[PDB]
């Protein structure tokens, strides 16, 4: 029923409930952001709200306030009619949290009050509730739909006539009646998903045709119940509750699929547990389908050679978008002879399928021990991969494929622009893709375009003079293997990550979304279990909002007032349980006295391998000591044990031993105990937690729960209803009475084993896991935690089939591992502070291995929870990350420059030197000349510089022509090459009367600012010194009436510049320094004929004689010499110009 | 009973998945050896596996299964391709005309415009390897390459297709042809086909669309027949290099991969059982509907400015299928009270 918005006409939008400190902390940063960045800018606001502080209530209150503001604007915009409705999203990874949040939002709408009276009337409430829609998965969406609604929609759209659809509908309808059974339930879920998919497909087909049904009244209501997204499409709702996977995938409406990522302009996005979404977004990114690069490029090269778009206004300027791609495809096909299929040669290539990994910038690894080449056998008409480079071919093919996808996105945008003027981006996007693919006959790429469009359509580039980062470029993984069913053809199955979760988040912020990430550990200093916030700060800058110290202090005060442990006498006890061999040995001997050999036979009963006996003994001793200390407690009743392993039936022997020890201590202490083994997400979600709550509420005694750090993060809240008759006064309330509407309590004792399994993994596919591991390695390298050497070794091991144990072993060496461990510990204890009821004493049992990790915590504790503060303070009583991180980034920046510069020079020496490459080269040289150092690392030239420990200069040691991984910097090289203003002799260079005016006019830096960021060794040597020499030579010579012209592309970068002089007609070429040389002379002359060459050193000693050299670089008479060598154009001692050198040079040309 | 219907849907999908993985494992270098209990269990799951290993020669199955073929541990076995010397006992033979016709009418429709454009694009350039495996195969496709180039030049296949007439937009254009002398079109007016080099579009407005569609169908069927002949030649070559069904899977995949025509894989597999079973459509041959069949083309929009030609073919009648089975060497015993109605 259309509850009119008019019911808010008299509603007082100025009247608001009292804002709690959290509400102010949310609103003030948003207020300032609007001032600084304006209305249309996005923002990311990580909110570290501790557990139990009211984070969910604050987020939902903010959402309701935004909804009311939208209602106000709607009431004001009715006169204008421009209804710019803004979408609000509440996103999280767990469906349970989504449903709970939506229910709580509705409850808040119903029960919220202002000054003791209901805030909204019944009609206002009914209107607001209609604005909120939940978007579950397709199977559950169908199952929740009633039979009447489904029959109504089928009749309305006439689908009941089709036999198959009715058969499937009936086959689902009856299964509903037996849904109680588990296997029947899973089968019904599968069938419901399939049927919903097909039904929505048919409905969209029906609506797209000329027979578009008219939705209204009962049919409209039924459709909106079947397709909740329809309510959003028709503007009956802006608020959407859904999961991160659903948010990324999008949801269907009556007409087409809607992808929120493509319509984030002006959206508000509340992400609960934001840090956890890095793993979820990564998991979605790793499920992308692999592509056969050979097939893709051959299809693209063939269909683009001839097929054309039509010349209607719908394709204004679209044909030009593909012109570069057509030329590149033709060139690539000619170079690599794509008229031939591909095949491998040699026994080793046949024995193992090849694998190539590339981060697309400077990290390249291949499973082949030898360098695999690629030749075209025109006799056999095959392209043979035998031991050009296969790596180069694959890289170029990937570049062309990604270029095609990006050009398709650009063409869709242009098509939408054109259609708008012909007289709704998502609707046009479906129309634009189909038309473009059909015109080019590329319908095979429809799936590839759709999947990539939303993820990477948010869209700086993989170039120097751009903000280079792994989070834009991602990574590529290619498998070269025989085509199934053939033994002579081969396919290049490539799997891509085109961006990291941090890149996705940054693109969402840049698209205009305002993101509120509420999470106790939103800013954990890790890049594997959290977004790379250094990268986010660089890309966003001001848009990455943060709480001022005053706001953090207000949050701390609110937390303490809401959880006043000190006033109410709640005490925290921390016990660092070490390993005790005698204790475990005695327990085992009591467990089975029959075993004469206490160690070996008993450990064999437990099934422990001889090698694992020590580790198993240690961790079991710690666990049993914790359990004993817990049971010895008089009042503590609920113990939660977090282990690195789950105690399922595979560990039944250790389970029985633990149960025996628990029973022994219960009988000794005469306290009933209940143990729960194998508490995984599924078990507690299904049955376990209900029985746990029953035991806690109805029976007196202690409870011990065994779970895992992973399982506990996807379970119910570890809280239970308090029975006052049973608990008595043992429970202390830490909050005000007005808040405790219901009496509940949570864990009072906890055991924390050291986390070790802290690397992400994707069980969806073998390729997905490979992509996940490579992403983690590259994220660590990008952050600076791993040196390029270590990162490359780890990547190579990953390609070869690294074991998870070895992967973890290499992860543990990074401080990122310690940060992740601290984050996981903080999340573990944080579940203790959920409820306002606490025992007088809280038992914190933690493995001794966490002492050093927790002892090194240094963050501001103003946002820590009480349990975490207790742990940290206890650890610190017993009595780096930014320096080694600085050394690593120096190597990475240098390595990236070395490989990028080498690649760029290689391209410039490809005879048709591209305009873009030449422009990039000149841009790099100009940047280095103008800004040899910079105060803050630049956004667009970040890889030209490294952050030196000493301002204005640094020391290094490495071979600029050798391995980039062998470089060393700063203190590790006390005696080594110095990168400083003095080494380049810039100070002496500028003293020349001509160089100084030239530099000042050009804006080049005549001196080095003593800044922290300095150019990397590769730049300083190869680029900066050469640029200085060229500029000085041009300045001095130009003073003597010399004129300079850009060298033609065909021979670009092989000579400095072309110089014309009065009275000389033959070409003159200049080469500036600050057998191979003979081959260059031949190359230039054979094409441009005879010419006079100048080889001049900008700085040096003028006393050295002028040498006239022939084409072969042997001294000869000036008339016979084709090359004139000037030992030093400017004096190196007094900066005076070598006038005599100029006079002799001028005479040299006039001899012709 | 309702649980059985859902269970059968799940069981069929899973059976296809399990056998597909089982065949992939056998195809791979790490083939799974089956003996004793494992061979007996695999034979129980696949009745076809017993026929493949020669454990059993007699097969009881339905006409639909016989035409479709049955899986073994290694691949799909199509009895129509191995009828040499094979006796048959067709109960109620006269009724099988309807069943074979029903199977023949289920073939997937093909977009002639897309098919011909893809064929032209991929045949203008790509070439087979000169190894003994393709000795004399490249010559089979030479006429087809020339015909594709000529067809593309004549009909300007560089441009997509669209309809200019309002009548064409209002009513979908259906074309029917028996391929010999019976031609009918739903369009009241004769539909022409012009290339607008200014608009870079091929426009169907009220050359002939009928001529274009007929030639496209001829070229497509020619491609499928040449693929069948190339598979036969590949099998012949492989024998000398030092059985037909296994090599047929190997020959089709290699030929399509070399030409970059993997998108036609599905079309080829359907074509051999129905038309590889076997005169031509020439006055100097044995003309008959029963081995020329019929074609039904449906011209409609894909987009509102691009058009596709969804063609559905009957390449032979049930009588043609039966005659080809007899000619292949099968001895057929059709027992039926009205066998000669």
PDB file of C-alpha atoms in Angstrom, chain A residues 170-175 178 187 190-191 194 292 295 298-299 301-303 305-311 314-315 319 338-341 379-382 431 434-435 438-441 443-444 483-486 488-489, chain B residues 2-3 5-6 9-10 13 27 111 113-114 117-118 120-122 124-131 133-134 138 157-160 198-201 249-250 253-254 257-260 262-263 265 302-306:
ATOM      1  CA  UNK A 170       6.123 -27.986  -8.356  1.00  0.00           C
ATOM      2  CA  UNK A 171       9.290 -29.995  -7.694  1.00  0.00           C
ATOM      3  CA  UNK A 172      10.470 -27.195  -5.414  1.00  0.00           C
ATOM      4  CA  UNK A 173       7.059 -26.585  -3.850  1.00  0.00           C
ATOM      5  CA  UNK A 174       6.676 -30.102  -2.473  1.00  0.00           C
ATOM      6  CA  UNK A 175      10.269 -30.337  -1.259  1.00  0.00           C
ATOM      7  CA  UNK A 178      10.030 -31.994   3.774  1.00  0.00           C
ATOM      8  CA  UNK A 187      18.923 -30.419  -2.173  1.00  0.00           C
ATOM      9  CA  UNK A 190      20.249 -26.209  -4.804  1.00  0.00           C
ATOM     10  CA  UNK A 191      16.971 -26.613  -6.695  1.00  0.00           C
ATOM     11  CA  UNK A 194      18.548 -23.044 -10.068  1.00  0.00           C
ATOM     12  CA  UNK A 292      42.973 -18.716 -22.898  1.00  0.00           C
ATOM     13  CA  UNK A 295      42.453 -18.094 -28.275  1.00  0.00           C
ATOM     14  CA  UNK A 298      43.587 -14.850 -32.149  1.00  0.00           C
ATOM     15  CA  UNK A 299      39.840 -14.197 -31.977  1.00  0.00           C
ATOM     16  CA  UNK A 301      43.078 -10.193 -34.112  1.00  0.00           C
ATOM     17  CA  UNK A 302      40.730 -11.939 -36.635  1.00  0.00           C
ATOM     18  CA  UNK A 303      37.413 -10.235 -35.804  1.00  0.00           C
ATOM     19  CA  UNK A 305      40.863  -7.007 -38.877  1.00  0.00           C
ATOM     20  CA  UNK A 306      37.671  -6.445 -40.877  1.00  0.00           C
ATOM     21  CA  UNK A 307      34.483  -5.946 -38.857  1.00  0.00           C
ATOM     22  CA  UNK A 308      33.296  -2.374 -38.347  1.00  0.00           C
ATOM     23  CA  UNK A 309      30.695  -0.435 -36.396  1.00  0.00           C
ATOM     24  CA  UNK A 310      27.951   1.449 -38.184  1.00  0.00           C
ATOM     25  CA  UNK A 311      28.105   5.206 -38.729  1.00  0.00           C
ATOM     26  CA  UNK A 314      25.061   5.800 -31.398  1.00  0.00           C
ATOM     27  CA  UNK A 315      28.808   5.244 -32.288  1.00  0.00           C
ATOM     28  CA  UNK A 319      35.262   3.682 -33.717  1.00  0.00           C
ATOM     29  CA  UNK A 338      49.260 -15.809 -35.019  1.00  0.00           C
ATOM     30  CA  UNK A 339      48.265 -17.599 -38.225  1.00  0.00           C
ATOM     31  CA  UNK A 340      49.851 -20.654 -36.557  1.00  0.00           C
ATOM     32  CA  UNK A 341      48.742 -22.536 -33.476  1.00  0.00           C
ATOM     33  CA  UNK A 379      57.902 -24.988 -42.690  1.00  0.00           C
ATOM     34  CA  UNK A 380      55.739 -26.670 -40.042  1.00  0.00           C
ATOM     35  CA  UNK A 381      53.353 -23.706 -39.637  1.00  0.00           C
ATOM     36  CA  UNK A 382      53.620 -23.947 -35.843  1.00  0.00           C
ATOM     37  CA  UNK A 431      22.517  -2.334 -24.360  1.00  0.00           C
ATOM     38  CA  UNK A 434      25.684  -6.323 -26.608  1.00  0.00           C
ATOM     39  CA  UNK A 435      25.657  -3.946 -29.582  1.00  0.00           C
ATOM     40  CA  UNK A 438      27.579  -8.047 -32.012  1.00  0.00           C
ATOM     41  CA  UNK A 439      28.905  -5.471 -34.479  1.00  0.00           C
ATOM     42  CA  UNK A 440      32.458  -6.776 -34.076  1.00  0.00           C
ATOM     43  CA  UNK A 441      31.292 -10.420 -33.948  1.00  0.00           C
ATOM     44  CA  UNK A 443      29.930 -12.283 -28.668  1.00  0.00           C
ATOM     45  CA  UNK A 444      32.343 -14.825 -27.172  1.00  0.00           C
ATOM     46  CA  UNK A 483      44.563 -28.535 -25.056  1.00  0.00           C
ATOM     47  CA  UNK A 484      42.349 -31.342 -23.806  1.00  0.00           C
ATOM     48  CA  UNK A 485      41.916 -34.012 -26.449  1.00  0.00           C
ATOM     49  CA  UNK A 486      44.879 -32.786 -28.504  1.00  0.00           C
ATOM     50  CA  UNK A 488      49.977 -30.871 -30.596  1.00  0.00           C
ATOM     51  CA  UNK A 489      48.142 -27.687 -29.614  1.00  0.00           C
TER      52      UNK A 489
ATOM     53  CA  UNK B   2       7.953 -35.715  -5.944  1.00  0.00           C
ATOM     54  CA  UNK B   3      11.322 -36.485  -4.198  1.00  0.00           C
ATOM     55  CA  UNK B   5      11.603 -36.194  -9.728  1.00  0.00           C
ATOM     56  CA  UNK B   6      14.062 -33.848  -7.865  1.00  0.00           C
ATOM     57  CA  UNK B   9      17.344 -34.112 -11.835  1.00  0.00           C
ATOM     58  CA  UNK B  10      20.224 -34.110  -9.260  1.00  0.00           C
ATOM     59  CA  UNK B  13      23.526 -33.718 -13.434  1.00  0.00           C
ATOM     60  CA  UNK B  27      42.578 -38.800 -21.003  1.00  0.00           C
ATOM     61  CA  UNK B 111      22.885 -18.014 -35.982  1.00  0.00           C
ATOM     62  CA  UNK B 113      25.205 -14.483 -39.653  1.00  0.00           C
ATOM     63  CA  UNK B 114      27.472 -15.105 -36.667  1.00  0.00           C
ATOM     64  CA  UNK B 117      31.260 -14.202 -40.095  1.00  0.00           C
ATOM     65  CA  UNK B 118      33.238 -16.341 -37.645  1.00  0.00           C
ATOM     66  CA  UNK B 120      35.264 -16.191 -42.736  1.00  0.00           C
ATOM     67  CA  UNK B 121      37.312 -14.378 -40.096  1.00  0.00           C
ATOM     68  CA  UNK B 122      39.022 -17.516 -38.821  1.00  0.00           C
ATOM     69  CA  UNK B 124      41.040 -16.062 -43.967  1.00  0.00           C
ATOM     70  CA  UNK B 125      44.174 -16.385 -41.826  1.00  0.00           C
ATOM     71  CA  UNK B 126      44.638 -19.511 -39.688  1.00  0.00           C
ATOM     72  CA  UNK B 127      46.387 -22.593 -41.055  1.00  0.00           C
ATOM     73  CA  UNK B 128      46.928 -26.226 -40.131  1.00  0.00           C
ATOM     74  CA  UNK B 129      50.279 -27.743 -39.242  1.00  0.00           C
ATOM     75  CA  UNK B 130      52.216 -29.453 -42.022  1.00  0.00           C
ATOM     76  CA  UNK B 131      52.825 -32.589 -39.941  1.00  0.00           C
ATOM     77  CA  UNK B 133      48.609 -35.825 -38.993  1.00  0.00           C
ATOM     78  CA  UNK B 134      47.148 -33.221 -41.491  1.00  0.00           C
ATOM     79  CA  UNK B 138      44.447 -28.712 -45.772  1.00  0.00           C
ATOM     80  CA  UNK B 157      30.255  -9.297 -44.134  1.00  0.00           C
ATOM     81  CA  UNK B 158      32.429  -6.550 -42.653  1.00  0.00           C
ATOM     82  CA  UNK B 159      29.083  -4.965 -41.724  1.00  0.00           C
ATOM     83  CA  UNK B 160      26.463  -6.256 -39.324  1.00  0.00           C
ATOM     84  CA  UNK B 198      27.908   5.141 -45.822  1.00  0.00           C
ATOM     85  CA  UNK B 199      26.221   3.610 -42.768  1.00  0.00           C
ATOM     86  CA  UNK B 200      28.485   0.525 -42.813  1.00  0.00           C
ATOM     87  CA  UNK B 201      25.426  -1.697 -42.356  1.00  0.00           C
ATOM     88  CA  UNK B 249      37.299 -36.910 -30.412  1.00  0.00           C
ATOM     89  CA  UNK B 250      41.057 -36.246 -31.108  1.00  0.00           C
ATOM     90  CA  UNK B 253      39.423 -30.900 -31.233  1.00  0.00           C
ATOM     91  CA  UNK B 254      42.731 -30.523 -33.083  1.00  0.00           C
ATOM     92  CA  UNK B 257      41.908 -25.546 -32.254  1.00  0.00           C
ATOM     93  CA  UNK B 258      44.198 -25.016 -35.244  1.00  0.00           C
ATOM     94  CA  UNK B 259      41.593 -22.889 -37.031  1.00  0.00           C
ATOM     95  CA  UNK B 260      40.491 -21.175 -33.790  1.00  0.00           C
ATOM     96  CA  UNK B 262      36.430 -24.024 -30.897  1.00  0.00           C
ATOM     97  CA  UNK B 263      33.029 -22.314 -30.760  1.00  0.00           C
ATOM     98  CA  UNK B 265      32.711 -27.831 -31.221  1.00  0.00           C
ATOM     99  CA  UNK B 302      19.521  -9.755 -31.011  1.00  0.00           C
ATOM    100  CA  UNK B 303      20.237  -4.409 -29.092  1.00  0.00           C
ATOM    101  CA  UNK B 304      17.623  -2.752 -31.387  1.00  0.00           C
ATOM    102  CA  UNK B 305      19.963  -2.026 -34.392  1.00  0.00           C
ATOM    103  CA  UNK B 306      21.554  -5.552 -34.987  1.00  0.00           C
TER     104      UNK B 306
END
